[PDB]
Structure formats: structure tokens, C-alpha cells
């Protein structure tokens, strides 16, 4: 006198302008899921895979990114990456076979490069087959503490950072699909973008504390594209536990969170006194900007065990609106 | 009808813990018990816990040692086989204290006596089944006078390949350039779901005359169990590789000298596990992450109980546990070049000295202190009391009252504290208030009838809770503050309805919330005042058996109601559990030749064929059976 439920094959047609939100979901709990928020009718949908598909999203989504009307969500513990229908999200296609995929860049229509944690190798692929088709090699890295994490595209090459117990960016030659040069800077960092000057932004975490690698205070770093030399340095205290810096449409005002959330023209040389949102008793945990409008998203994780929320806040810090999702969102995409 | 003054303990019949051979020992409790068992394989990860607590205060001992090892302050009940013990108490909540401290939930009381059996009784059981599943056990015993023996030794292997309609992740069929065609629900096999456990145990006993009992016994396993790929694992089992090795070993000595009045007893015993986990991946193959990690412990004990005469008994006792760890999770590249790990390595005292008085003024009124001083590597605990009474309220039906209040506290585990991936080696010890009341009930020899019903209630102030960071790792913090009542029934029967027409039966039902009484940790918390997560809120388990003649039948069955996979308590699509109704049945035939006793045995699991859920994500297996037969002295 019990049952198991599969189905619920739900299917809708949905706005052109929306934001996901990747839930990580818990470990082996395989209740990851994805949500759709319309920021015009401030209306989310929750479970959209699941409900969409009659199938669950897997264990551990980490991110997503568009490429021509389909979007590829990388799914961490079930080493695969879903492609699916912007629209209806229905899968259109996956990729098995990975380590586990953090996070996934296009080259062009048939070339495609995926990071992963616990692996020395950046595993290429072609979305056009769906299949895997390649390694890149990264040097000075094994098995055991291997890992890249993002990825900018600057001209023929690709930088990327090296996350968990790495302190180094790797340059990669496109043309040759093999890593050709590195940059050693702080300790761990977390994430790699680029502004509109072809500068790139880089923020470590420095370590933990007792590491055999390193603890030290995280830092903001400004590295020139063009030379791949450190330009800036921006210190902050130690015992701070930033995320990944974040930029904006215009590629002018970088964003992060710190124990607050702050936002810094690239061209400064000093972080600013004050804040862009004071602290408000909020786990914040997730954080992205609407590159058509500037509005900030932030994701409170809460308890990291029920569904969290995220706050949609207007450029100017008013509240417009706030809205329940998955558990634990740790990433955005922008449709 | 003393020591157990005001005490709730559950114990376990004969056949109950002997049943079948494999069966674990979660397999034990979670039929002829009621507490909730995390669990979904058969090689799983079985944890128990009391009535609306957590699994951290459900600690055991066997032959008076801690077998939780301090590194993570519980025991896997996987890890033991039913045929493994002769003795096995369960002491619940406030009732645990009086055998050892820092028990918040209750403890589980196990020990192996001498079968005292007279010469040479080997015995041999083979059994089959299921998915190419085997089990072997054989017990070689000797008898004497004043010497006694007895080797035990398990043997289980399978490859857990069980088929499962994998309502949880779809398959496509694709065509030309890998244009998606058809999407269907597979009929998969458990991945890397295999296991191989041995186990050993030899005891040696010695008795005189006089009350002077010596004993020894020293238990090894050696544990090969491949983790589960989760339902949503789109990876080849033969490609990636997950292992999970456990070489342990529980020794134990004991010196008793026990006469009329006075019964004391020392013990001295040692553990020591290690525990090696892989993860691999083919390129021919290299380790993602692989670790060893092996902690050791020694251990002292002593207990006494003066008792003058009746209506005054004295018991005091000590247990320390002096432990040993070294941790090693991962082998990094040093910024140096160097090659470095980051396992910690400690090892702390654990003390608990204990003294109680059970005073019985009448045969009606009774009461009980017991008192403790806990002492955790350099930290003195706040005294741990508690104190029991019991009242016969009528001698038709024996109908008697028992109420019992304490305040308990757990320490930190040396992972709660030393873990250096984590953090947070200052985390306070976990206090928890609590308070029961009971009734008991009991009618009689060619009929009888019993049962009972009782009374939960606790407070936990700051328990420990891992939380992740922005960082990717988990770290402690002593946030939430539960609150858990909760009532437990028990009730067995048998009348023999004939000659030989014997018909045992029990069950037991609880209710146990454990609600979240906690700081609201963000405006949007809807955890505020919830159960907590995979604690479910009814459960209830009936064992019913007859005989006739050397024919004998019993039937299990258990039912817990949701289990909230979230902590808002919210239903979701993607994270729902609905109630879990198990229902499984064993038969066995006995016929006794000359000098030998024969058995043929067969048992059932999920019947019905059911194809559900009890843990998030993990797949059961359908209906399955196991076939046994025993020659026995």
C-alpha cells in the first residue's frame, strides 16, 4: 500500500525575456532543480525540469549558459549536462560522461570546452553532436586536486582559473586547443571576467584556515589582457568569504558579496567606504545583475535546507519584489 | 524488579535477533522496535534514531564499550549481523544514564554471553537468493565444566544488480544528427551497489566455583562495499569506480566477581577501525579522491552495586575511552611543489563516572538518582543527572507508573571540532532537558497478554548542525534549538490456543515530532516552527508468529509516515516521501535427527512487489527472497 509517481509531463510556452536560477539542491538528494522568473509579471516557476520532463534534473546544477535559443545546464554530481529548449524547457539533448562539469563556455557552433573539479583535464566537446571530443591538459594539476572553474574568451585565447587548492589562470590557445601559459596571483580564485577595457577581474578566497596550501586574506585582482601581467590588487580582510565577482551589461560596475553587497567601478583605485545593500539579517549567497536594466537579483540561501528566496532589488536599492525558488540558488542565467 | 526502577528499556526475544542470518541488525530493531532507520539498501547506511532525535544521540555499547567512534559519535548497523549478539538491551532516554552518559536519545546495550552449551556444537547455515545474493555462518563451539569457547564467522557476498523501473531520470532514442526521437523510463540495474563483509568473533569464557567469571572475545570485520550511483548518476559503472573499505577490529575483557549482595565487575577493552574510500574515473584508471583514515582506541572500565539487603542498592561505574585518530582526506601539490595532505591527527579522554541510589520504600512506591560527571578531553561536563520513580498502581494487571526527568549532554565529535577541510573546533556541547512518564500492564500460563504506553518530551538547546559556505565545504555551527516530545506503545501477547498451538505476537507505535524551536535564521524562514527534515512524524511496526509443532511462521510489517526531505516541510514534486508501508515474511521447518537438529528456512522481503522510495534519490529493489538452511546442535 504504497507507490512510487512517475509523469506529469507538463508543457508550456513561456516569455522571451526571463531569468533561471539554478538550485544546487543536497548532495545525493537528486533535488536539484530549476526555476524561471518573469521579471514583467514578477511570477516564478518552480521544479520547470522536473515538471517539463517527468524526470529529475539530477544532483548538482552549478550553472547555465545560452547559446542559440538553448541552454546547457551543467549538472555537477550526475555528470551530464542537459541542453533544453528555452522556451518550452524540454530536453532537447545531453552530454554524459563528465568528471563533474562546472561550468561550460562556446567557442563556435561545434566547439565547446567544459571545466571540471577533481580533474586535470578540460573536457571539449561539439553541442552540434553531443558527444565528447577531447581533453586539455592543464599543467601542475592531478587528479586528486585538479580544477578550473571559469572561462573568458580574449581574442584566439581563453583564460580560465584554477579554483580548489590552485592559485594560478591558465592561457589556452584556441587554435591549438592545448594550454600554452599561466599566471600564479592569490591563493584559490574563484571566478574570471572581463570588462570593457579587456582587463579581467579575478577574486581569491584565500584558502582556509590550517590548509597545507595556503590561508591567507582574499583579494580583488585586475590583470591586463593584452600583457597577462597584475595591474591591481584590492586586499580585504582576513576571515571574509566572497563570491564571485559578477559583472553588469555594460561591463563598468563590478559586483560581489562580501557580508554585504558591494559595487565598484573598474576604474577605481580603492574599494568604496559604502555599501550598495547594508547588511539585512540575510544569508546572502547568490548574486547577479540584469544586464538590460541594472536591477540586482540576490539569492538568500536561508538554512540551506529548505527553498530559498531571492530579493529583486531596482538600481537604486528599492525593493520591487522578492520570490521563493529552489534550494541553495548559487547561479543565474539571463534569457 | 530493581535497577530497572522508573527505567524504559526494550528487550529482544530469543528468536527475534536469530531469525535469519544476513538480516543486519537494523534489520532487528526497525521490526521489533520503533525508531526511525535511515536506510535504503541491504549494505546501506542503516542509522537509528530515538524518539524525535537525532542519530548523534543515539549511542551503543557492547560489553560496556563505546563502539560510536569518536570521529563521527555514531554506529553503523550495517556493520553487524543478527547472529553476532546474545544479549541486547535498549535503553531509552532518560533511562540510558544509568549504563553510561552523554546518551541524549538513549542507548542500545549489547553484549555476547557463553551459550553454555556442553562439547563440540558446530553449527553451519548457507543460504541463497535474491540477486545472486550468498550468505555463509558457522559457529565451531566448546564446552567444559569450567573453560568454555565458542568461534563465530560470517560470510556475505553480493552484486546488487537489482532491476528497477528508474522512475527518477529517462533514457532517448536518438536518429540522424542526433535529433532526440523517444524519451522512456529504463529498466536499470543498481550501479556499483556491490558488497562482500566477513566478520569473525572468538570468545573464550572461565568460571570456579566461587563467583569469579572471566571472559574474552575479539571481534574482526573486514567490510567491501560499493556505494550506490544515485538514481540521477548518468555515468557507466564500469567506467567510474566508488569503494568503500572497512577494516575494523572490537576487542573486550571482563572480570566479574559477584556474590549475594554485592555483584562487581572490570572490563578492558580496544577498537580500532580504518576506513579507506575511493573515487576513481578511466582516462588505465586514476583516483579523483581517495583517502585512508584510521582512529584506534583504548578503553577502562569498572562497575560495582553494593545492595543491603532489600529497599537500598548502591551502583557506581566508569567507563574512560582514551581514543586515537589520524585523518587524510586528499594529497594536494603544495605551492612549493612539495607534495602535502590535509588529514588532521588528535585523540582526547573520554570519562564517565556514574553513581546511583534505587531506594523502594514499599512494593508500591520506588525511586532512583543516578548521577554523572562527564569529562571529554580537558573539559569538565556539567553534572548529568536523572532521577526515576515507579509505583505499582495495582497489582491486578501489575498495572505500574514510572516517570523519570534528567538533563543530558553530548560532546563534539573530533570531526565536529578537528576537521580541517571544516572548521569550527569550538563548537559547546549540546544540552538537552528532558522528562518521560509511562504505565505498564501485564495478565497471565496458559494465556498471557502485556503492553505499555509512555510519555516524550525534550528541549535541545544549541545543537550542532553543518551548514555549506560560499566556499564549497561544509563547517559547523550550534544554531538550532529542537524540541522533541513524543509517546511510545508496546503490547505482546501469546495464549496457547491448544496443545501446541503457540502464537507470539507484539507491536509498537510512536509519535515523535521533533519541531524546530530555533532563532528564524533569515526573514523567509519557514523552518521556524516545522519538523525537522527525514523525521518522521507517526511510525509503527507489528511482529505477529505462530507455531504448530516443529512448523513455525512470522510476519513483519512497518509503517513511517512522510519524511520531510526539507526543512520548510513544504511539499515539492522533486523531493516528496510518501509513507513507507514494508511488509515482509519469513517460514522455517525444524525436524531433529540423533545428536543433530536440522532447519530449512525462507524468507521475503518488500512484498507486494512495491516499487517505492525511503531515502530521496536512492532506488529499492523489488520484491526479494532468501532461502536458508541450518544444521545446528
Redesign the interface.
Known sequence: ??????G?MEDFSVSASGLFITNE??F??????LSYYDPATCEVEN?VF??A???????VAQSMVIRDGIGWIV?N????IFAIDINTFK????I??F??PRYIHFLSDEKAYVTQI??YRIFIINP????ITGYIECP??????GSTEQMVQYGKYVYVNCW??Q?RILKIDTETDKVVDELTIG?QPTSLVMDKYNKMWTIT?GG???????YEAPSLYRIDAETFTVEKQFKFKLGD???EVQLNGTRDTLYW?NNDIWRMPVEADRVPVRPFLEF????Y?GLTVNPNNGEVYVA??????????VYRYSPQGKLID?F?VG??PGAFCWK | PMKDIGVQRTRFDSIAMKENIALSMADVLTFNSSVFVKNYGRATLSTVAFRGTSPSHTQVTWNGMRINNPMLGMTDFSTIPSYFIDDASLLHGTSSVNETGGGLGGLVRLSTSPANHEGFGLQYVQGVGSFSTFDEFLRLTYGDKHWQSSTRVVYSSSPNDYKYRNRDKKENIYDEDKNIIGSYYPTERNRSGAYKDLHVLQEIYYNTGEGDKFGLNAWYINSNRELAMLSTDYGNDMDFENRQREQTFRGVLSWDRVREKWKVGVKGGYIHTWMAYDYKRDKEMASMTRSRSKINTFYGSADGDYAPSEKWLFTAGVSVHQHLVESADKNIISQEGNKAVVGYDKGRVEFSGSVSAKWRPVDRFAASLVLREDMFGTEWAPVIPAFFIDGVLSKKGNIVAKASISRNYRFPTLNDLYFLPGGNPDLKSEHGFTYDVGLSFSVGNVYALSGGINWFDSHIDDWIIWLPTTKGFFSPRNLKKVHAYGAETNAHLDIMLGKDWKLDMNGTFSWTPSINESEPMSPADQSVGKQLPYVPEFSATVTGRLSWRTWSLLYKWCYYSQRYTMSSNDYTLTGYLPPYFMNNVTLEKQLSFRWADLSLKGSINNLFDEEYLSVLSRPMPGINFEIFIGITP
Open positions: 500500500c504504497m507507490k512510487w509517481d512517475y506529469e539542491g543536497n545525493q538528494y537528486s533535488n536539484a532543480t521544479e522536473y515538471r520532463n517527468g524526470f529529475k534534473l539530477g544532483d549538472v554530481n550526475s555528470h551530464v530536453e532537447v539533448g545531453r554524459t560522461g568528471t563533474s577533481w580533474d552540434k553532436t553531443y558527444e601542475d594539476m592531478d587528479m586528486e586536486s580548489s587548492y592559485n591563493i578566497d582556509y584556515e590550517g590548509s597545507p596550501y595556503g568569504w566572497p563570491s558579496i539585512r539579517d540575510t544569508k549567497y538568500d540561501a536561508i538554512d540551506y535546507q529548505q527553498q530559498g528566496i522578492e521563493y534550494i541553495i
